[PDB]
Amino acid sequence: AGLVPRGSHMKILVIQGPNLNMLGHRDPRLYGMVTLDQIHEIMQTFVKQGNLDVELEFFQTNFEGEIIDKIQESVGSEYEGIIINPGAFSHTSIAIADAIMLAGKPVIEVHLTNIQAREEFRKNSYTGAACGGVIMGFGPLGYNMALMAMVNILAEMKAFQEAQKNNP
Amino acid sequence: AGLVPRGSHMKILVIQGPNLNMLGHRDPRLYGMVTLDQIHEIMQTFVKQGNLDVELEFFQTNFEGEIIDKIQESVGSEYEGIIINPGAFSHTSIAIADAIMLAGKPVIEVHLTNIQAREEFRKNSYTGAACGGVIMGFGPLGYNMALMAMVNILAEMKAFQEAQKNNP
Ligand SMILES: O=c1c2ccccc2oc2ccc(S(=O)(=O)N=c3[nH]nn[nH]3)cc12
Numbered sequence A, B: 001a002g003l004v005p006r007g008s009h010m011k012i013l014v015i016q017g018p019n020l021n022m023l024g025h026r027d028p029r030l031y032g033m034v035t036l037d038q039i040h041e042i043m044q045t046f047v048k049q050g051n052l053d054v055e056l057e058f059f060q061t062n063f064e065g066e067i068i069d070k071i072q073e074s075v076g077s078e079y080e081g082i083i084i085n086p087g088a089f090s091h092t093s094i095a096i097a098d099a100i101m102l103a104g105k106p107v108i109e110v111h112l113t114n115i116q117a118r119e120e121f122r123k124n125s126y127t128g129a130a131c132g133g134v135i136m137g138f139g140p141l142g143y144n145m146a147l148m149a150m151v152n153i154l155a156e157m158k159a160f161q162e163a164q165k166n167n168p
């Protein structure tokens, strides 16, 4: 008793789906040539500026199967929550949505654009329905909003579980 | 020149739509009896904790027309941005969506629940499509996320407009 110091390395996995790696090379003039690496740096700076004890891991892929593999690799292993932008797969991938459903951890969906405001085929998100919450239309800023939420959620889950939940 | 001290009273209007006033009296056991007034207090505390120079005004109504009147009253007058939860009107009110479209200021939509994860009739948001961005499924926390975003947006709009934009 009293032998386990606190508190948190929170470990959050950020999964980016198809085409996002081309940000700032084709577009966005919409955010003035911000790149995907730059969004990731922005998230790291958010952590630093808040003096938060958070470890971020970043992963981008154009493959549905690589997204599912990555979600599965997190289930047994260390990552406490996932921030995901499945991009265009959000509207079609029942398989990714099911993988999220049974990930056993909080998952937050982010989109750069307001997918509710575009073509009819972009309005549906199977994956969004599986996630706890969805953020859309804030550009890179949306990712910092997702991080703010995830830190709150993971900090409160600990409080409950331990100290309270249990003092072995 | 140099005769106008800076910087910000940001004035943000928070508009809550139908049934939300009954939070914590019928539900949410979903958030343990949090009331609508309590959400508003949470937002005020967010401002205080960040030492932000932000003024919040709160308004709840069960009337579509009162929401439109309130949006209009902001156009000519002082409020720099709107955070809105139109609730069940989101799925049906073209009129509120049009009022948002021409509000001439940033408008962010928030829902407590993940409306993408419920009945088919709740998935559509006319109002969400009109807003710059949408946040759903974070409970009260979503409102603090909306505030974080709005402060960023309004701070950057000033930088541009003034100093840069213009030094009369
Ligand atoms: O805006 C972009 C974008 C711009 C330049 C080059 C590549 C790009 O890839 C993207 C991928 C996803 C998104 S997204 O707005 O984050 N998600 C979407 N879901 N369905 N459609 N969009 C925006 C984008």
Ligand SMILES: O=c1c2ccccc2oc2ccc(S(=O)(=O)N=c3[nH]nn[nH]3)cc12
Binding pocket: B018, B019, B020, B021, B022, B023, B024, B026, B027, B028, B085, B086, B087, B088, B089, B090, B110, B111, B112, B113, B114, B115, B122
């Ligand atoms: O969860 C509630 C709620 C619980 C107890 C009593 C009244 C309530 O009113 C609400 C009003 C709106 C929402 S809402 O999830 O923020 N927005 C919705 N749009 N369409 N359906 N829901 C949740 C709610």
